[PDB]
Design a protein around this nucleic acid. Structure first.
Ligand code: MG
Length: 520
DNA sequence: GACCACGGCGCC
DNA sequence: AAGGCGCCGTGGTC
């Protein structure tokens, strides 16, 4: 089938990177397949200019690499997206190939022919799946182009500020470490939970409460240590040591070393086929779990800044999952609460209760994750459902359907297969139930945010603004100072009106020089 | 160098 | 708020 480069327009592309991150990868090889032919590019970088779109497996990644090189090469069809819609457990090329009629190799030509062949089969599987096709055409496929922009754009980071902060935190860690070592009566590796275990529960003879899941060792987690916060001063130091080292090792130290030499910015990856619910994920590095709660966490978030002459615009959906719950269940009362613009919670304290049913929390975990009366905690949970009968009925209906079909679905029909709903082991069955009825909620919220990104992106391009980050129910944009206000106002409207529900969606928006101040 | 499992923990 | 994730250091292996 081998023919000379270039391929005819519309061909399926195959490509090989030196490493998984497209912003950092060397393009080792490039090929394309179509009409019973395969075309291999003599020089991949040059040949990249001959393509009009990236059609094939991992299309977005190639598109990002093209953007890095200053080329406009939007991602198109991608068999990975079709398979992910069919079954969100389809997360890798390896598995999708083996499942739908091929083998994922390390040769571009074969990857091109594979892309073509797999697209043929998958597109066949999606016939009759009207709603899955809608998600593909209206959400996933167009979203892939938005994600490519975000990845290639990156976000600015105050490196010098983080470098200075590292030295400050290092000294405080030293202070905690030396103190812990004194109390232990000896020095040990504080980073080793095994060594720590022995020191706390054997040597210091402190009470061992819970056990680890897989190996049944005596846990040293924060939930456990919290309880011993008064039973020994060493516990206090250990918990402070944990926060500082976690944030230093995970964010403060690594991030500055990841600045791209061409862009001068930090670039993450937004993985589009990585979760069981339809959410995006972020990696290399993960920019969806940057610290925000503690004082030191806030210091770190301040390092994410706007380019000179620009401002960050931060938009957050308010309680989107609860609003989705109101819609899906059709519960009159819950719906009323939002319609009348009242704070559902008043309708961390009583909030744990309201945000509690979204995953069926343990009535016992209410006296712990909220410190209540325990026995009396499992007594108010009935009133919750007494006032929201349609919610219980919805949960019940969801599970019943999940058992019969073998899957649950979001408002738009995104599916997740949950096979353990009839497991004969209680703990397993019940864990499965929690996954099952959470996904229509978390998944619908993901569908909505994705659709909002798809609608918003073209509007931002028109205004010379950029989309930088998504954090599940949040967006961070970057706009020129003279257009920031207009951008903020427009984005809010797009997000709030993405897909009208039985209840309004509300969005909080802020503008600032950095990620933290942009909220306040 | 590389991979993995685990406990642990950061965010939504 | 913390079902859904990704990264850390440790500990073990090849
Ligand atoms: Mg794990």
């Amino acid at each position: 089938e081998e023919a000379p480069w270039p391929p005819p327009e519309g061909a399926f592309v195959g490509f090989v990177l030196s490493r998984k991150e497209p912003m950092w990868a060397d393009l080792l090889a490039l090929a394309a397949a179509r009409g019973g032919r395969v075309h291999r590019a003599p020089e991949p970088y040059k040949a990249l200019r001959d393509l009009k779109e990236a059609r094939g497996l991992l299309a977005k990644d190639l598109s990002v690499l093209a953007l890095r090189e200053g080329l406009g090469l939007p991602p198109g069809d991608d068999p990975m997206l079709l398979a992910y819609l069919l079954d969100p457990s389809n997360t890798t090329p390896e598995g999708v190939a083996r499942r739908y009629g091929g083998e994922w190799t390390e040769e571009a030509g074969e990857r091109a022919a594979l892309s073509e062949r797999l697209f043929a089969n998958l597109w066949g599987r999606l016939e009759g799946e009207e709603r899955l096709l809608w998600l593909y055409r209206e959400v996933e496929r167009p979203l892939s182009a938005v994600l490519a922009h975000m990845e290639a754009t990156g976000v600015r980071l105050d490196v010098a500020y983080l470098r200075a902060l590292s030295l400050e935190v290092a000294e405080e860690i030293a202070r905690l470490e030396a103190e812990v070592f004194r109390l232990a009566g000896h020095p040990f590796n504080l980073n080793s939970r095994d060594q720590l275990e022995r020191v706390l529960f054997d040597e210091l003879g402190l009470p061992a409460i819970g056990k680890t899941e897989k190996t049944g060792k005596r846990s040293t987690s924060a939930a456990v240590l919290e309880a011993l916060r008064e039973a020994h001063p060493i516990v206090e130091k250990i918990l402070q040591y944990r926060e500082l080292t976690k944030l230093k090792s995970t964010y403060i130290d690594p991030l500055p070393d990841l600045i791209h030499p061409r862009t001068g910015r930090l670039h993450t990856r937004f993985n589009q086929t990585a979760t069981a619910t339809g959410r995006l994920s972020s990696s290399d590095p993960n920019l969806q779990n940057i610290p925000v709660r503690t004082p030191l966490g806030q210091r770190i978030r301040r390092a994410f800044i706007a380019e000179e002459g620009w401002l960050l615009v931060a938009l957050d959906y308010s309680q989107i999952e609860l609003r989705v719950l109101a819609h899906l269940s059709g519960d009159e009362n819950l719906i009323r609460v939002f319609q009348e613009g009242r704070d559902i919670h008043t309708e961390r304290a009583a909030k744990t209760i309201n945000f509690g049913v979204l995953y069926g929390m343990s009535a016992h975990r209410l006296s712990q994750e909220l410190a209540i009366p325990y026995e009396e905690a499992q007594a108010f949970i009935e009133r919750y459902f007494q006032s929201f009968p349609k919610v219980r009925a919805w949960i019940e209906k969801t599970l019943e359907e999940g058992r019969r079909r073998g899957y649950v679905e979001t408002l738009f029909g995104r599916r997740r297969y949950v096979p353990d709903l009839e497991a004969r082991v209680k703990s397993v069955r019940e864990a499965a139930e929690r996954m099952a009825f959470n996904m229509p909620v978390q998944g619908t919220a993901a569908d909505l945010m994705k659709l909002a990104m798809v609608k918003l992106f073209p509007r931002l391009e028109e205004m010379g603004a950029r989309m930088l980050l998504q954090v599940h129910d949040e967006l961070v944009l970057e706009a020129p100072k003279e257009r920031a206000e207009a951008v903020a106002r427009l984005a809010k409207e797009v997000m709030e009106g993405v897909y009208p529900l039985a209840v309004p969606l509300e969005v909080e928006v802020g503008i600032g020089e950095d990620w933290l101040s942009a909220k306040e």
